[PDB]
Amino acid sequence: TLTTISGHSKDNLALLKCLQGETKEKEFEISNVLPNHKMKEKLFRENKLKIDIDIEKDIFNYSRKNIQKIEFMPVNRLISQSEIDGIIGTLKEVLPTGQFTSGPFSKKLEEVIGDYLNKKYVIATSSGTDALMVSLLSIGIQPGDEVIMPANSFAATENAVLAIGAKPVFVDIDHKSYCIDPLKIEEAITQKTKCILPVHLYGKQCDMKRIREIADVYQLRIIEDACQAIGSSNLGEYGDIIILSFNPYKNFGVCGKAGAIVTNNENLAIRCNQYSYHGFEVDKKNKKVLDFGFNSKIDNLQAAIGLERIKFLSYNNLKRVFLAQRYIRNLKELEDRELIKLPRMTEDNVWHLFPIRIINGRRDEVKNKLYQLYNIETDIYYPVLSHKHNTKLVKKNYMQDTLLNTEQVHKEILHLPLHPNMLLEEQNFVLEGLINVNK
Amino acid sequence: TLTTISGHSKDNLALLKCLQGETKEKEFEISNVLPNHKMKEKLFRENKLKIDIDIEKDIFNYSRKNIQKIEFMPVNRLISQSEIDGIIGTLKEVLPTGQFTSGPFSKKLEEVIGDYLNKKYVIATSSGTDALMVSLLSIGIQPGDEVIMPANSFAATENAVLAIGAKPVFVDIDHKSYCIDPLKIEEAITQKTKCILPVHLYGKQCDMKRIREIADVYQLRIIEDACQAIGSSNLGEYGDIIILSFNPYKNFGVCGKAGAIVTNNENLAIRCNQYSYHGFEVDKKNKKVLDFGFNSKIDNLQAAIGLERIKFLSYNNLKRVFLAQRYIRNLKELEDRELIKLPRMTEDNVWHLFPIRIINGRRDEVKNKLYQLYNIETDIYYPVLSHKHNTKLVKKNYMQDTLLNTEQVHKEILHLPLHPNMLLEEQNFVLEGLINVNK
Amino acid sequence: TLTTISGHSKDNLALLKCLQGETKEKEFEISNVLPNHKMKEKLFRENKLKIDIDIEKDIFNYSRKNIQKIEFMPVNRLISQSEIDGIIGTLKEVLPTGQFTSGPFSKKLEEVIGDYLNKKYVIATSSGTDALMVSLLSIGIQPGDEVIMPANSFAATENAVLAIGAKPVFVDIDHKSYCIDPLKIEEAITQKTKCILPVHLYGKQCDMKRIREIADVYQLRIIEDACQAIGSSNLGEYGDIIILSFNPYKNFGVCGKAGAIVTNNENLAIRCNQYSYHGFEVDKKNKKVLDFGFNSKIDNLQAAIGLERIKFLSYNNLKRVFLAQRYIRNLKELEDRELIKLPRMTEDNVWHLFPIRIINGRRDEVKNKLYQLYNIETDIYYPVLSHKHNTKLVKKNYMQDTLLNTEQVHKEILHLPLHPNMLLEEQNFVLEGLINVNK
Amino acid sequence: TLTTISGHSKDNLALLKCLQGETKEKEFEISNVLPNHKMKEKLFRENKLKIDIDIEKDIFNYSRKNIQKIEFMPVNRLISQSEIDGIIGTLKEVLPTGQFTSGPFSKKLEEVIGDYLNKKYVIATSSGTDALMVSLLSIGIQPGDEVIMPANSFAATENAVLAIGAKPVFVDIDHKSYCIDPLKIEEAITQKTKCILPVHLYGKQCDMKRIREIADVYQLRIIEDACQAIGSSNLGEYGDIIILSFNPYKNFGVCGKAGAIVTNNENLAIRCNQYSYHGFEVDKKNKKVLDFGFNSKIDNLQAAIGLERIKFLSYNNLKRVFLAQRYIRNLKELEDRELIKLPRMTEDNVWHLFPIRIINGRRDEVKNKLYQLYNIETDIYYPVLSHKHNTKLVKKNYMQDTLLNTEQVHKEILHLPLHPNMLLEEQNFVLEGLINVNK
Ligand SMILES: Cc1ncc(COP(=O)(O)O)c(/C=N/[C@@H]2[C@@H](O)[C@@H](O)O[C@H](COP(=O)(O)O)[C@H]2O)c1O
Ligand SMILES: Cc1ncc(COP(=O)(O)O)c(/C=N/[C@@H]2[C@@H](O)[C@@H](O)O[C@H](COP(=O)(O)O)[C@H]2O)c1O
Ligand SMILES: Cc1ncc(COP(=O)(O)O)c(/C=N/[C@@H]2[C@@H](O)[C@@H](O)O[C@H](COP(=O)(O)O)[C@H]2O)c1O
Ligand SMILES: Cc1ncc(COP(=O)(O)O)c(/C=N/[C@@H]2[C@@H](O)[C@@H](O)O[C@H](COP(=O)(O)O)[C@H]2O)c1O
Ligand code: NA
């Protein structure tokens, strides 16, 4: 039996189970899309999987290194020499052209992203925040319009709504995935609601079928904040517009800020294109057709960088899945003792961030001791809920919000270091620290 | 007498006069600031002016090259090999740090810009448009507030006002500089005015002393749109906030989008710093103190590129001034014949764009024949005035606006090719075509 | 314990042992001297050793590249693109100065070399041969004086002695290191002896403590030919003068001919400076104080090139040690079988060349079959001993010389390809041919 | 009548007389040899002399510049940006080859030089000094042999003879050209004399006819020191070997040290080739056929530089002749008043240095006042005669030497700044100082 690896999360998990022998029924080929470039070079020979693949030594370079300390996300580790070499070579081609803002590599990256997402229209933007603001204006959001969203995302999700004058309406998360609870959304719908803005937090997709069911009944749009979820299988099937970020810390990043708007909806795509560049008619600069717009297309220079770095996407995502499975398998004893709750392996998760829950009040102690006693940095994404910031807006509009689940989970969440060029020895050091602090 | 070349417009003009023998007892030294680095290596030795400089042959590489056509702004010509080699060098240093968005080059570029503008506080941003939006919010603009501005700037100026819900109030330009007429500002002030937004159009400064007199009487803020005017002597002396753009077409540009907010006002600088980065407290990521903000700081990668390219700013500004003077001197007869109006040489102008006025209704014919008969591209920055776009906003709010001078000048203006890597042979081709089409 | 990497032989061996995990709980910082520039960039982060270094994959770029032949020293492989980019950068600074022979980079390189060798005085010369000629004059060599030296060096060593009219007196090598046998020196001393000229052949130091013991008894000077040994720890400790070569094939080279004279002795340094420039008093051009001299200082241009290329010296020397250790370890079975003798790993060797001995008279067969059958070039440095040339000098003076060890070793020696930009795949191709030809 | 400009001194004088209108009946073409490249590009169109040549403005960029001070030979002025651009261009092709000592550009430069000199054999060397020493060894000079030479050359001439153990025998110069008096040579021949070493001092050729007549009678070689005289018509007609220097201050220089041996004598040329590289058989490295040799071939990198710089030779020599004529015409009055003696214009002089004689004891006064009062540097090439250095050799061997005309001339000689990129305003400043100090 034969699977063609598409570069997305489902097939990465299927390949991993093959690499580990949890399966032997299956043979693999790999498609020639750009996000598969590195995986194909590293793990395949003549479109056949190499026979002698040692995940520990060949993919993670395991060599019994002695570790002294763990930073959560050392940004030098997120880019490889291979990537740098490719970036320098492409920039030697782009720089003499003098096209750094407008240019032909933006269109190419838009097409690559459009193929990878199976979506007809892509507008590459100067950031995921800008993509979200432009997308909200394209569906007609006016000041005072309400947008339903969770309260545990990065500040950008709420800020894009606020920047255009609209009003966040917070809904509680579910009990299993850190995502907006579909069963709480309907009761928060008012005559002012226009949009549901679910977040695929930490790289895990929301239950989009149920959210679409509700949005159709209420004739609401869905804009999906997928800034942490590139590569997740079937991303965007039910959404009107899907928002990506290509910030450098994302699973796929450029070398600066960038993002994208993705849709099948031609009218919405056209309005996005106009809003993202000053309100001008597309291809008629200086001639406004919308009342205003932003200076929010991607830079040609970053698009060219991104066409190099996206070559590593499926492979780095495969490394993330392996790391996550290792945390799950090696921390299971702490969950069986009912000290922590672990994520479960699912076929949609791309493991941008790896959350655990430390229960019965111990989270701060565990995080503090990991750092002070074992020199392990862990982090909390994010440290303040949307309805709890020290702001005039919160004091004026959000003091009556209670989000029971979100608030309880927030007292328990802790993120563990997980990034694709981490060493297995580094993960072992984290694993030993977590076990030892819970003894 | 001994003068230090500071890298700004006044000293560049004095240097040009000395190179050309219009002043005699003049020694020069060159200040060792980054924007002078190229001028110091090309024209100075032992901190004195080289004796053997020939402007036409050494600065413009005149060779009697044969020219067959002229493009207005071929973007490959705006960056030199020397700049490219330096940009590859600094990319090799920045890329392995993995610092692409936040980073240390952003702070250094802010310090360089603060030194060159003699201002205490600089927030480097993701574009000049973003700089303008943030600055407007920093002075307290709320939806419905009015901003007094001209109607002949690039769309970005009005768009920044509109995107935060404010209302442009358009005032006519003066009769001599394409800038907002100070004598028409006061009658446009209402209870809703919060800011005057003069634009230093084409590289020429507005009459800021008069505008400040009015602003002080009405206790109004001034935000100066200086996106075209970097290098202009005494820029900002009377402004609360100055906006710069480092778009690649500007007199100084990076290799993508960027800009800056410059101020001596610490309160405004702090608010700018918070609104440019999600409303977070300064250095307190994910902890909001303002109600929202944007994702609008410069990319560290672009700051590094800008620290390399700004080395060319004073030298490129000097080449622009010489080109401008050459147009003025060689087209004098067409003005004496009352066919065109020429700019005047002034100490503040950095000649981002070179406007002439074709009078007696001939502008369209001169533009079209220059291209179709003489193979010379000219342009009109900008083709539609702010109150004349076919937008809902204009149809609803601006149909009674009459800006007599702006509208009359708009029928006569034409921009001639002017960019610092032009050949004098290319400028000669322009000049001959302008003379011939006006026989 | 913390060790500062100095960039010399001994600390490179300690660093390689740490990287390979032959020591534990060694931490490293790196000295900020110019010869360590590349090693600091590539291997350290915040003045600590990077945790994620994989020698084969990151330092040698191993990719299982297919190899079909091996050349011994392809000169295009001795210089990297990084070096070229830096050389072009510094040529852009030096060329407009017009300073190409005399100039300030020569001084800077003399200071760098003096700091690296821990010596007070450095005269940078036009070649190592010139450095040795000048040095011999500086210690007072007159025509007819004898200089004790080995017979297995490059011809330059004997040529410098002969060019000033002095007489080589050849002494046999020891049985373990290719270097002059200290126990054979005293018997060759006559009333004419003025200098002992040991050669640190192939990168390995001679036994300088014992040679100094003899020299002191007989009031002899020692000039050390260290032209192959830059970076060897404690070089020069017992020598009056040390000679270096910066020819492009050395462990550190420029892009042309250059070398240096290094000494703590101010009298000799002054006389070297005088003889290396026409016999002129120091800084007194055209005014002789010595009877004559040569035109033998370094070119300023080569000195500037040297300041760029030397940045790679410690890293390239580290790579050479790894390559040497891999030959020793992978060829051990052939020494066990009594087919070959291998060098030992020692803290002083910088591995400019990698000698083995092929015993039982098989050297010529193995060399020829490695080439003809296996497409591997090896070489013999040097093919003719000093007393065995068909020259009038040899036929008149050296026909009674018997140098038993030198002659026997000369029948067995064979150099294997070894240069820092070799691939490990290329070294594997050499290893396989050597194993195979000795089946 | 039609002349084809060959690039040598005679045709340059002819061409100068045409550019000035002192000849009417003469048409010019120019040959396509490398030393004519810049003159052909600058002054010709389709192998015809440009109609419109203004020597002052087109060749000297005369622009009524205001001069403050004169340095005798500022080395930054000896290289043009055109040359620098070409040098960077050729090194971008040379550096990746890794051929920096041995290489193919050396052979090309030898071929260009042999054609320019009309000689069959050229050995490009690491300096002129090295060329001279190798040449003397090639004709069989042994320690104690005598070499007849003048006492007023650069120290290299005598040093090369001394360095190999031979004995300079000084002969007085003539009354008209600073060159060895042929009428005083024969009286200095002893049974030890082996060679006459005339020097083409300051760019002026010695009377080689009468010298060759003497050498034939006595079976002596002639080695001509032409290190200052490249471009001189009919150079080397009568000499066995002609020495060149390509030092960067010469009329043609590289960017470092280099020179050449030029001969028609194949036996000498072969011996020179061997002595210049360690005594090895040609194309048989490491196999000595001579007793010793040097490391004295040109660097391939310098040969590549020289192929770019020699493009400017004929044009720069033309500039020198104009400057020299201009000094002669404008100082004529001082010679008429019997205060100075001036050179006369001749067809062989390439004007490397411009000598005058200040008579009646005033030379020191004029030199000192020119510098103290007028900030004009002049110089004396050379400050000490060969038999007057305070060296042990002079005390032992040359105290009896009296060279009447040399010594008298030496009391009178002063050199005036002359280099091709000098400005005519600079030369005017020198002229004015010279007149004003002599009234
Ligand atoms: C769910 C979601 N929606 C929307 C967005 C907005 O996506 P941009 O507008 O493309 O960032 C984000 C972005 N999040 C990261 C953030 O997690 C942190 O690492 O900090 C970086 C910023 O860190 P630096 O400023 O140091 O790059 C942010 O990019 C996001 O995560
Ligand atoms: C007065 C003023 N205020 C404000 C602004 C806004 O400054 P950013 O936000 O930094 O651009 C500008 C910018 N203007 C140029 C525009 O002239 C044209 O060339 O088009 C480019 C855009 O061309 P590309 O998209 O091809 O870069 C613009 O950058 C400006 O000129
Ligand atoms: C021990 C000793 N002392 C003294 C010397 C003299 O050091 P320079 O005078 O600096 O070379 C040397 C030099 N040796 C090399 C030689 O090994 C060979 O590769 O050939 C090149 C010559 O090769 P090319 O001419 O192709 O560069 C020589 O540089 C030397 O090795
Ligand atoms: C007649 C004659 N023979 C022979 C020679 C020997 O020619 P190389 O061996 O090629 O120089 C020379 C050279 N002379 C100059 C000297 O004039 C002065 O400018 O000083 C420079 C040195 O100045 P720098 O060291 O600063 O380069 C010397 O090169 C020479 O002139
Ligand atoms: Na933006």
Ligand code: NA
């Ligand atoms: Na030499």
